[PDB]
Amino acid sequence: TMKVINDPIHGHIELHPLLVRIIDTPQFQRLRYIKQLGGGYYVFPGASHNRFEHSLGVGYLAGCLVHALGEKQPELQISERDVLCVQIAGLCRNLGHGPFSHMFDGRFIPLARPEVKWTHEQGSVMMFEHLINSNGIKPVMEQYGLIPEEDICFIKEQIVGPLELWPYKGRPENKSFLYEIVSNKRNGIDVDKWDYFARDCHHLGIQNNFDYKRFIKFARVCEVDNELRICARDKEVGNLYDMFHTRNSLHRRAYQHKVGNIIDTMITDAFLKADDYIEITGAGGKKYRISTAIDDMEAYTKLTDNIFLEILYSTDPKLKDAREILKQIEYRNLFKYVGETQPTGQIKIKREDYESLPKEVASAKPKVLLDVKLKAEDFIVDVINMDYGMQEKNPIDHVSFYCKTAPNRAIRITKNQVSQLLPEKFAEQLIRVYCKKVDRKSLYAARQYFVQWCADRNFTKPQDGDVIAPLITPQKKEWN
Amino acid sequence: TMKVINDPIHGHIELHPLLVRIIDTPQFQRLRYIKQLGGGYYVFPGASHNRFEHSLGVGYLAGCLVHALGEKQPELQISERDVLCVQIAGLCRNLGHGPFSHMFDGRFIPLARPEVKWTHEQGSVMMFEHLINSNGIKPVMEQYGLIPEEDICFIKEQIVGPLELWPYKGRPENKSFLYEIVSNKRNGIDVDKWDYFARDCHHLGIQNNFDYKRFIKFARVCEVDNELRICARDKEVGNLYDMFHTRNSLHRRAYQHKVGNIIDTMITDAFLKADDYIEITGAGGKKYRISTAIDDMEAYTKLTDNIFLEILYSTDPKLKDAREILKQIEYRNLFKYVGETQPTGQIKIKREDYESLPKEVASAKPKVLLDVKLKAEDFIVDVINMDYGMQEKNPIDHVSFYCKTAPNRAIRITKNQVSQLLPEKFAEQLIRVYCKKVDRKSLYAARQYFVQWCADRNFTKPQDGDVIAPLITPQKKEWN
Amino acid sequence: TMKVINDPIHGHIELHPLLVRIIDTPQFQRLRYIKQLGGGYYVFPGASHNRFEHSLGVGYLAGCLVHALGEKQPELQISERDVLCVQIAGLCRNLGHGPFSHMFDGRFIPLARPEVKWTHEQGSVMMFEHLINSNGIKPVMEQYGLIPEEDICFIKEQIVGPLELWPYKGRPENKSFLYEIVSNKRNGIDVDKWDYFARDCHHLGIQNNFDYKRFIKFARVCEVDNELRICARDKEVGNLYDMFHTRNSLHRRAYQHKVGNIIDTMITDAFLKADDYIEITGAGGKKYRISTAIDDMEAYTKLTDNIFLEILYSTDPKLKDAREILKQIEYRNLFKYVGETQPTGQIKIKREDYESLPKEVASAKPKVLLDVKLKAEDFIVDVINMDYGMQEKNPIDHVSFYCKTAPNRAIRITKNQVSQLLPEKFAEQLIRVYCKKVDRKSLYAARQYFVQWCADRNFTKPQDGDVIAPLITPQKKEWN
Amino acid sequence: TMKVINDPIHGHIELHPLLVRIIDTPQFQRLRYIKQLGGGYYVFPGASHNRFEHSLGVGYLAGCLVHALGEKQPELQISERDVLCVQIAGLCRNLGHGPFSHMFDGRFIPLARPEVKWTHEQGSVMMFEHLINSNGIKPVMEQYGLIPEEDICFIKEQIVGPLELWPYKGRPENKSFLYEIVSNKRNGIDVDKWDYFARDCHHLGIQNNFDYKRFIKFARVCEVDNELRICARDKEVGNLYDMFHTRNSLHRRAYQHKVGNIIDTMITDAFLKADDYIEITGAGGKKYRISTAIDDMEAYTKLTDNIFLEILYSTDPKLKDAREILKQIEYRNLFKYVGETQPTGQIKIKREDYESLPKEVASAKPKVLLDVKLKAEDFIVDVINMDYGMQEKNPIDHVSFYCKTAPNRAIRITKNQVSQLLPEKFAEQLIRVYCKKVDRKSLYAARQYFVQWCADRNFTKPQDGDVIAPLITPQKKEWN
Ligand SMILES: Nc1ncnc2c1ncn2[C@H]1C[C@H](O)[C@@H](COP(=O)(O)OP(=O)(O)OP(=O)(O)O)O1
Ligand SMILES: Nc1ncnc2c1ncn2[C@H]1C[C@H](O)[C@@H](COP(=O)(O)OP(=O)(O)OP(=O)(O)O)O1
Ligand SMILES: Nc1ncnc2c1ncn2[C@H]1C[C@H](O)[C@@H](COP(=O)(O)OP(=O)(O)OP(=O)(O)O)O1
Ligand SMILES: Nc1ncnc2c1ncn2[C@H]1C[C@H](O)[C@@H](COP(=O)(O)OP(=O)(O)OP(=O)(O)O)O1
Ligand SMILES: [Mg+2]
Ligand SMILES: [Mg+2]
């Protein structure tokens, strides 16, 4: 019967035997060897935590919220079956993450298999399928009153959305609210965030400005457009705006730390140079690469942060180039950050243009004395899209609220009904430039190119522009 | 010699004997009987803390920062004398607060002595003067190397600004940075905030999004316009914006909680009805009122939260009206919140108009069935100015930064150099309306007046407008 | 309907309307004006907390545990009625505390009304009776399914024990376990402790070594001697020992801090000198003293920490003596701690003997040069009984455990089955001596008397004996 | 110049450039891949932390304490040189740890190379030597005013004790107190503990009962027996006893968790079965085993937790046996805990007897019906020595204290001068028995053997003895 796990964020979590059974598989335990924050550990030494513990946390909160709704509203007829299905989805939405988490689907796969479209969510589903089949979980699900045909569909839909109008098959419109819990496609307000805010802050040594327990206490289900949706108490609208401010602030300080990102980049680089030579045994002894392990779940199961050390410790001279990069990390000879700027007004930059940016920076011609001349391959240019989870859209516009005087009546709240101190935009781009040539003079040069390039493209003045390129900044009137 | 105090926020604080001597006086100990958050305790039961502990905290952080600067830059020639003066100012800037803190100078005095102009800062200075003189502190200051003539001036200036060009007398332009520590008139970034953020969050059960220790580690002094000012590392600019976001959020959730404010109001009302009958003995046996105790520091010394209980426990029928209000608080029959709205576009409301607003709301004529008709005296209207500490101004525009490549060279950073996700405005007004008549029907009515009044004045649509006044909201096109 | 309160220790607590109604009375709200830790605030400035918030906490935890038992074991047939009754007892066990909490029943009443026997528990019951009657709570109890005759008895028994074998009337032997929750007379393991551990640590700035949530998750009810009792999982026995270690450690560092205690003593002294002159209006306009207010609950209601300030701020020269003592506290001219010692071996000291100890210390004749000669009235001697809650008894010997392999079978665990690193004794006495004469030479003398007295009585050598009385310590062989 | 690192336990730590240089080496960065708590991660999912972060913490606290002593007492003439040497020793005392930390030197090496004597301390020294030489650190040490000949000796002595009367060469008797900071051989009170208490509690979700900051504030150096030693303020003696209670409690609940230990045991077993086949390249391409990598630091550098996954992911059938054990861990088919007991009175068990205990348990002949008969190889028996760090000795007897009235005069404090509630013994043994045969009937049998064996050897009655072996416990009178 049921187990208790002590978690520093949530305290003692009770786990239903079915969930234990799911947890105690190689597919799930694999998450113990995948850092939540990837290269962030190398900047924030507190951040040792792995996707495993985060997954328990999500599972538990999913459970908390669904239970709370059932207690508050029996009329919903939430069953233990529904509860466990939501918890399982909670536990399992991180199953698909690869080495160093977002480094893998955010940097490595895009560059190593550009044609394929892949997300950790896709992978979570496949890994889940594989986990169920490989471990005879279906019988156990039935033993506790679950219906695998319907429920496995439901669970997958919770994670990834429809597998193709009410587009969901796993549950009907009257249980629409269950899809809003683990991975909310409508506005991004889900228990996944709540766990990582708390867990990441605890580990990074930053403090979390969002109360998820509070939010659970005020959550109700109401009818909205013939769907039953989760609604938040009206006055909590400020807390929701703050939730996304907090998310943005965590990305600014931690998830997109300039050095954290450059380490992610150097690791990705090394993975690219090892991809040809590393072999991972999949189903039936068949062999895959780092970049193809995503095609066989038995291979993907063995693909974790360990790869990094496999490479670092290798003696094969095939891997000399990859290994040498990782060693530079250890000695802390990293590519050097040059600076940060943003596009101006309407200007927006797409993924297809990314490869051509180092070339543009090298093409800048600053009117300054240069010892060394720098080449496109010497520049790395990271473009980062910061938003409130919905590109240009305001997610609070996609949230339903209920007032105390009419608790069953859903309503909408506009930005102007809340505050004038809110942002007018909800998306932006940051551009970081780094140089692969580390010496004083290369770095000095790189600054001139960079700042010149900003001026050429009419980007925003880097904060330290006047100090790093005092001869370049005067040419631009707007800058001063 | 020196004492150690254990504080839940800062741990063990060391106190120089001179500071102990200052602390162990009636004037200072008085702060033990003054709640930091006033009426907020009646909403947030964690908020039992008094100004006393907050004052130690401020003192300590003042000391931390001044010491840190001296360690980092000996060339500043910060003396122990300077350190103690800053700490004393730190300890003493809350000396002038009255019962329930901001209730007293924010609500009570304005209404009870409208002709006088008064602030707790004014009072801190007078109370400090009184504390020094009444306790023979001057000899002790000299004993530890302080020069009372110069230093007492310095201390007062730190708290209140110039007592009347370099306008400060207590210290020269080369020590300009010492004025920026305890009460920063230039941009509001001071240790007072840092302590209350941490202390209030710990007690309220909210979490603080600002790392003051970090800020202290990155603080340097640089020349700016022939002044030596405290400068912050450039990349910490985001943390500063977040500091004020946090401040605004604390006000939204706690310091301006609608019910917290109404309790402050009811306490103010009771004080008004007792002001004629409560007598407080000042200097030479002379007697004062609650509203006149501010004229004699010996009387003000005895004016604390105790007044509230004096009134509650009184048997004198003179005080029946005041006592009856406090009893309604105990039974939780409070004035009832009707709703909240804001002015539109440019509209701004001054203090002189405040008294006339209940009258405007009563003058609204909603086209709805009314059992009761409500009068101006039945309405309370609270107008709340939310800003980043400098009305319409952005305080980060008044902050100086230094880059890592040129640490002595101060620079400025504009909003656009940081983010497009920042606010476009830095000030706003909230209007809350409450009704003194509590029954169902008076309340129902009050909602109609309120919503009608909003429509009449072209204010923003209250969030729950459609639910509380469904017959009123349709008339306004813009609202729907 | 139900309210949510944000508590820093427990987060958001939900409160049933009935409990709200009980809370929103003058008798309950009174607890807002009574410091949990009395004089400890004057040592630990974090400790601003009042009995009110503690009481909410205890209420909530009582609820948590009773709910957990019902969820785990439906066969117990715990009703909502039972739940609310336990919560009410939880909320209400601190109702009887007087000014500065344990100062009042621990020091003041014993000295001021020696003939009467009184405890805050007695008073909690009376105040509860008074609260129910004075506020028409009985109808509201019936409205929510409670049976006042039985339930009010039950609630009182939970707080104070039997009002006179199964000695309880409010509930039968089959619900015996409900008595173990709020105030466990059998072994002292109850939710009251769990709240104060957490709450006091949070405020004092100390850290709590006991996980009550864990304990709740492992709690079961089992049959023991034809009673149904709460049983703890066997392996949690170490945690229980640690619970009492933590309690003892809190008393050592905080609740019995030498200076905290002396302040309690000086406050008590001032109350004694004011007792004749302070009048408090009880039932029918009849008037009481501080020391007699315990006889009429209407008067006791108005007896709070406020008394302290009433006295401090008084101008009546009747109160000059009392007032002067409080002023010495403010200036921090406190009675001076001389030292601490313990009885040896079997020696135990009774409460009646307390009055004769100052006399013994003054009777010591140390062979040393004395400027001043000290008198019995110049000495204060505080005797403190430190135990695990049950004098000489080990409370874990009165705890029932269950094993995982037979969850319904209760068992006992002896000390030797746990560890040899546990204490061999569970009770002891500390003796502190203070001098009322504060000057260098009186204090120097006092140390000689004290240390001599220790030697005479064959008490333990004070830790600093050799430093304070180097001429006295050599005479005792055992000491060196 | 200097770097700042954000640590969740200590906040922002400043690092001197020299220390950064030491940190940014393969030898130091290796610690990132070694779990502080080894197998405890598999029980406490919060415990993801590695030795790396702990090492920074120790470095920083070493620095805090030495600085504090210098500030308090300039007469000590502590130089920046001394400071950095202490910090380097702090950073580097964990350099020698092997995979899963104490699993490696506590279980694996003892069994795999019984003839060799080895500790992580030995290895820390060797790894340090290797780190200095392999990275040209000596020049950098000289650049900052260090004298490698004297200082490297000093640093090593701090870690391991004398390398062979004042037995230390690195510094004279007048700087004796510097040896007490990083690794205190006299009484075990050092900054290593302080960091792990705080860091481990934060991660395990347990709470730490020891205030190291406080202790640093009250630490002074005094003369004791012609040495200058660190002394603690007398009244802090209780906090020290509590420090060790906390240590013992952490071991009870976490470091010696029965299942955590069994996982360590299964990992060890797998390492043994892989030891023959895993090869690790050391100096000059020469190859070592897991068990011999301790002989060449270049090989040891590459020996980390990674080994575990290397084995788990291997396809080599040489490793089938090792791999199969790790897989049982992943599926959570672990050896089963049977129970725990202790020796009685004087009985003590030496290391030489350990191998023979499974045999004794199998030799027990319980008078009960047995389906299966169990063999010595089916039993694991773990013997755990719990003490206060000094076997039978009380470490507080080896601590020096200073009183407030004579701060330069060291003194001693005995147990009886503190409390009678302290332990009478400071060392004990726990015996845990596990069965490798997991089925119902094997497990049932195992309990009979175990309990019978306890009875035979006159060990303490297992807590659940009566439930698991009701037929066996009656035979022993003492048990009942
Ligand atoms: N004393 C403690 N305090 C806090 N957390 C603990 C303590 N002991 C164990 N834990 C943690 C470790 C685990 O994540 C979780 C479960 O541990 P534990 O209760 O010992 O389970 P177990 O499986 O070992 O016991 P059993 O199977 O015998 O019930 O709680
Ligand atoms: N063991 C403790 N742990 C944490 N904080 C403590 C402890 N003991 C006391 N404190 C707190 C309470 C006070 O605010 C502050 C100082 O108390 P303390 O150190 O006992 O000074 P004291 O003035 O009582 O002793 P002395 O006058 O003999 O130096 O520290
Ligand atoms: N944003 C917040 N975060 C954390 N706690 C909060 C926040 N806002 C309020 N609290 C606390 C203060 C109270 O103790 C508790 C209840 O406050 P609140 O939810 O505002 O009730 P209320 O009575 O004002 O609203 P209503 O009656 O309109 O539901 O929550
Ligand atoms: N906003 C933040 N709040 C708290 N900690 C932070 C924040 N930003 C960074 N940190 C942490 C992460 C690192 O462990 C440590 C180093 O900080 P950081 O200033 O990012 O150094 P850096 O090397 O990237 O700056 P630079 O090299 O430009 O001086 O501080
Ligand atoms: Mg003292
Ligand atoms: Mg850097």
DSSP A233-299: EGGGHHHHHHHHHHHHHHIIIIIT-HHHHHHHHHHHHHHHHHTTT--EE-GGG-EE-TTTGGG-HHH
Of the candidates A354, A424, A394, the one whose C-alpha atom is nearest the C-alpha of residue B419 is A424
d(CA C235, CA B242): 47
- Opening angle at CA A68, ends A65 and A70, nearest 5: 115
d(CA C253, CA C38): 15
Length of chain B: 480
- Cβ-defined contacts of B290-295 (< 8 Å, 24+): B290/B108, B290/B112, B291/B108, B291/B109, B291/B112, B291/B113, B292/B113, B294/B98, B294/B109, B294/B116, B294/B118, B294/B123
Of the candidates B244, B239, B210, B192, the one whose C-alpha atom is nearest the C-alpha of residue B395 is B244
Of the candidates C26, C91, C14, C20, the one whose C-alpha atom is nearest the C-alpha of residue C56 is C91
> Do the beta carbons of residue D301 and residue D26 sit within 8 Å?
yes
Q: B378: which DSSP letter? A: G
* Chain D residues near residue A29 by CB distance under 8 angstroms: 330
Ligand 1: atom nearest CA of A7 is 14
Residues A63, A64, A67, A73: what is their CA dihedral angle, to the nearest 10 degrees?
A: -140
Other beta carbons less than 10 A from residue D149's beta carbon:
11
Q: Which residue's alpha carbon is nearest to atom 7 within ligand 1?
A: D253
> Do the beta carbons of residue D230 and residue D177 sit within 8 Å?
yes
Task: Check if C120 is active-site.
Answer: yes
> Do the beta carbons of residue C263 and residue C39 sit within 8 Å?
yes
- Opening angle at CA B341, ends B337 and B343, nearest 5: 145
d(CA C2, CA C18): 9
Other beta carbons less than 10 A from residue A437's beta carbon:
17
Length of chain A: 480
- Which residue reads 């120089």 in tokens? B16
Structure tokens at B401: 């930064």
Helical H segments across A16-50, by residue range: 17-23, 26-29
Under DSSP, is residue B373 helix (H, G, I), strand (E, B) or coil? coil
For chain C, the residues whose C-beta falls within 8 A of a C-beta of chain B are 5-9, 11, 20, 24-26, 29, 32-33, 41, 44-46, 48-50, 52-53, 56, 202-206, 281, 285, 302, 304, 306, 309-310, 313, 315, 327, 330-332
Structure tokens at C362: 């003054």
> Do the beta carbons of residue A423 and residue B423 sit within 8 Å?
yes
* Chain C residues near residue D257 by CB distance under 8 angstroms: none
Quick check: CB of A211 below 6 Å from ligand 3?
yes
Give the determination technique: X-ray
Other beta carbons less than 10 A from residue C358's beta carbon:
20
d(CA C427, CA C390): 8
Structure tokens at A156: 């997958």
Q: B285: which DSSP letter? A: G
Buried b (16+ CB within 10 A) or exposed e, C234-246: bbbbbbbbbbbbb
- Opening angle at CA B59, ends B56 and B60, nearest 5: 90
* Chain B residues near residue C26 by CB distance under 8 angstroms: 327, 330-331
Give distance in angstroms: CA of A4 to centre of ligand 1: 7
d(CA C37, CA B39): 22
* Chain B residues near residue A413 by CB distance under 8 angstroms: 463
Q: Which CATH number fits domain C1-333: 3.40.50.1820, 1.10.3720.10, 1.20.1730.10, 1.10.3210.10?
A: 1.10.3210.10
CB pairs under 8 A between B and C: 90
d(CA C23, CA C14): 13
Distance to chain C for D278, nearest Cα, Å: 40
Give distance in angstroms: CA of B392 to centre of ligand 4: 31
* Chain C residues near residue B41 by CB distance under 8 angstroms: 32
Of the candidates B384, B385, B382, B391, the one whose C-alpha atom is nearest the C-alpha of residue B355 is B382
Write the DSSP assignment of B426-447 as a string of letters: SEEEEEEEEES--SHHHHHHHH
> Do the beta carbons of residue B206 and residue B253 sit within 8 Å?
yes
Q: Residue D229: which residues within 8 A CB-CB, separation 6 or more?
A: D176, D177, D180, D221, D222, D223, D400, D410
Question: Which residues of B are identified as catalytic?
Answer: 120
Answer positive or negative: Cα dihedral of D152, D158, D160, D166.
positive
Helical H segments across D73-147, by residue range: 80-92, 102-103, 109-112, 120-135, 137-143
Structure tokens at A74: 């029996």
Domain ranges of chain B: 1-333, 334-480
- Which of D6, D300, D305 to mutate to probe the A interface, most A CBs <10 Å? D6
d(CA C241, CA C245): 6
- Which residue reads 């508590």 in tokens? C7
Structure tokens at A2: 């049921």
Structure tokens at B435: 């009704």
Q: Are C463 and D206 inside 8 Å of each other by CB?
A: no
d(CA A118, CA A431): 24
Q: D107: which DSSP letter? A: I
Structure tokens at A145: 């009153």
Give distance in angstroms: CA of C402 to centre of ligand 1: 15
d(CA D338, CA D448): 10
Buried b (16+ CB within 10 A) or exposed e, C294-330: bbbbbbbbbbbbbbbbbbbbbeeeebeebbebbeebb
> Do the beta carbons of residue C178 and residue C171 sit within 8 Å?
yes
Under DSSP, is residue D97 helix (H, G, I), strand (E, B) or coil? coil
Q: Which residues have C-beta atoms less than 6 Å from ligand 2?
A: B 4-6; C 43-44, 206, 253, 259; D 211, 214, 239, 404
Distance to chain D for A325, nearest Cα, Å: 13
Return the residue of B nearest to A206 by Cα. Answer: B209
Buried b (16+ CB within 10 A) or exposed e, D272-284: bbbbeebebbbee
Amino acid in position D289: R
Of the candidates B464, A229, A235, A12, the one whose C-alpha atom is nearest the C-alpha of residue C4 is A235
- Which residue reads 């203070």 in tokens? C434
d(CA C310, CA C325): 13
Pairing between β-strand D11-15 and β-strand B401-402 as defined by DSSP bridges: unpaired
Residue A133, burial from CB neighbour count under 10 angstroms (0-12, 13-18, 19+) = exposed
Answer positive or negative: Cα dihedral of B232, B236, B241, B243.
negative
> Do the beta carbons of residue B446 and residue B437 sit within 8 Å?
yes
Structure tokens at A96: 């698909």
Q: Which residue's alpha carbon is nearest to atom 9 within ligand 2?
A: C253
Other beta carbons less than 10 A from residue D474's beta carbon:
11
Q: A7: which DSSP letter? A: E
Write the DSSP assignment of B37-78 as a string of letters: TGGGGGT-TT---BHHHHHHHHHHHHHHHHHHHHHH-GGG--
Quick check: CB of B206 below 6 Å from ligand 3?
yes
Other beta carbons less than 10 A from residue D197's beta carbon:
22
Quick check: CB of C418 below 6 Å from ligand 3?
no
Rg value, chain D, Cα: 24
> Do the beta carbons of residue B329 and residue B438 sit within 8 Å?
no
- The shares of helix, strand and coil residues in chain A, as percent rounded to the nearest 5, are 55, 15, 35
Q: Are D207 and C206 inside 8 Å of each other by CB?
A: no
Quick check: CB of B241 below 6 Å from ligand 3?
no
End-to-end Cα separation, chain A, in angstroms: 70
Rounded to the nearest 10 degrees, what angle do helices D148-160 and D80-92 cross at?
Answer: 50
Of the candidates A322, A308, A210, A346, the one whose C-alpha atom is nearest the C-alpha of residue A274 is A322
Give distance in angstroms: CA of B403 to centre of ligand 4: 14
**What residues pair up with A379 in beta bridges, in sequence order?**
A435
Q: Is B122 left (phi over 0), alpha (psi -120 to 50) or beta?
A: alpha
Q: Are B327 and C29 inside 8 Å of each other by CB?
A: no
Return the residue of A nearest to B400 by Cα. Answer: A463
Structure tokens at A213: 């327990």
Of the candidates A192, A206, A289, the one whose C-alpha atom is nearest the C-alpha of residue A246 is A206
Of the candidates D264, D219, D341, the one whose C-alpha atom is nearest the C-alpha of residue D99 is D264
Of C237, C406, C460, the CB nearest to D467: C406
Quick check: CB of A239 below 6 Å from ligand 3?
yes
Q: Which ligand is nearest to the CA of D249?
A: 1
